[PDB]
């Protein structure tokens, strides 16, 4: 993924547990080479999965727990490290924001030309709920989606309950989530 | 399962979509025979699975969506139809409550002598998270667990993020969930 994603993971861990723990985690991941991540440069996905795996071992937490945290962090981190206006342009409510999400990533992708963004389709089951279809070229990041949805809830002061109802992981064509809000 | 469970399903559907729908649903499940469920009597599990499938066809919603709703409802329905004090005895926080859950179901089963309750084990990964191990003699109810957990979040005013990381369905030994709270 682009290095911004890894820089975020680093930031989150550095801020929550310290530079020593980040160093250990980098080292365990077999990335001591890399002095720093370049935000606008493409890295092999490997780098991200390894960091997450290594972060799991060192912190003694499951990978999935970290991806949930990281999902929520990213909402804050993007608003502060140069994507605040772009974020705000995507709307001022959760369902609006999610409807716009492919369009946000399209805009991101003019600037990051090699982006393989996820794809998100909403079916609104009412004014307070929806089905969210998450399609990705990558495996394993549904728990990140969950955290991202909870970060979006914080951003719009909406309470969101999210439950995953289909799993790419088992062989289903793609992750699907039921979501209830305010 | 005991009829209480089926009575709760009936109630949730009558209250949400009307008696006419309930009838259809009951009709579709091939249970027109049964005039009312007896709360303290044992039914074949068959009855609950048919009602759920039938509810899915009549309503145009996936089974899994209904089980999530039903899980959340049950938390409210038990507190109002005779299990309020027992619920409250199980604690005033989500992680406490989950640690007490086998004990709760044990008390329930002195009163319901043929109870096949689930089993839940918590490994706390921090003061705000845990791995929850759901063991059951039955298949299919993981989405019900998700709703129940959201229902418990409501009861304790805690925001809970839940993601399932192992699936009995696929032949893994049992369902496992990563959970983050408030
Ligand atoms: C300003 C806001 C955002 C920016 C700059 C951003 C940028 C990115 C970038 C650069 C990637 C890497 C894709 C790649 O390298 O191939 C990505 C992936 C991702 N984005 Fe965003 N994004 C933003 C907001 C969001 C939000 C709010 C969500 C919420 C659901 C979201 C969900 C994801 C997901 C799930 C991926 C995972 C990759 C995959 O599934 O294939 N993004 N995004
Ligand atoms: C407070 C009152 C509660 C009562 C009275 C109650 C009673 C029951 C009863 C009677 C069953 C049917 C089992 C059978 O017929 O053999 C059952 C199943 C179940 N209970 Fe509860 N329970 C309560 C709360 C909860 C809560 C909060 C949860 C949250 C996790 C929970 C999780 C379940 C699950 C998952 C089942 C499904 C059966 C299975 O996995 O085998 N229960 N409970
Ligand atoms: C990979 C990452 O932190 N994200 C999450 C959403 N968009 C990019
Ligand atoms: C069958 C069912 O939803 N439950 C859940 C908790 N206790 C009973």
UniProtKB/TrEMBL annotation, chains A, B:
What is the name of the protein in this document? Alr2278 protein
**Key word DNA-binding present:** no
Give the organism, scientific name.
Nostoc sp. (strain PCC 7120 / SAG 25.82 / UTEX 2576)
Organism phylogeny? Bacteria, Bacillati, Cyanobacteriota, Cyanophyceae, Nostocales
User: Where does the chain bind heme b?
Assistant: 2, 74, 105, 116, 134, 136, 138
Keywords from UniProt, A to Z, are: Heme, Iron, Metal-binding
Report whether Iron shows up as a keyword of the record: yes
């Amino acid at each position: 993924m682009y290095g911004l994603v890894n820089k975020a993971i680093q930031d989150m861990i550095s801020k929550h547990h310290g530079e020593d723990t980040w160093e250990a985690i980098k080292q365990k991941a077999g990335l001591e080479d890399i002095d720093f991540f370049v935000g606008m440069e493409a890295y092999s996905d490997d780098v991200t999965y390894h960091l997450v795996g290594a972060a799991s071992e060192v912190l003694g937490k499951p990978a999935e727990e970290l991806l949930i945290a990281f999902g929520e962090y990213w909402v804050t981190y993007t608003s502060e490290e140069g994507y605040g206006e772009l974020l705000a342009s995507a709307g001022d409510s959760l369902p609006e924001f999610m409807e716009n999400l492919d369009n946000l990533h399209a805009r991101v992708g003019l600037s990051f030309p090699q982006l393989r963004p996820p794809a998100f389709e909403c079916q609104h089951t009412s004014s307070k709920s929806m089905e969210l279809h998450y399609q990705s070229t990558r495996a394993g990041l549904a728990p990140m989606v969950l955290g991202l949805l909870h970060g979006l809830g914080k951003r719009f002061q909406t309470k969101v309950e999210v439950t995953q109802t289909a799993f790419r992981e088992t062989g289903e064509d793609h992750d699907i989530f039921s979501i209830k809000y305010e």
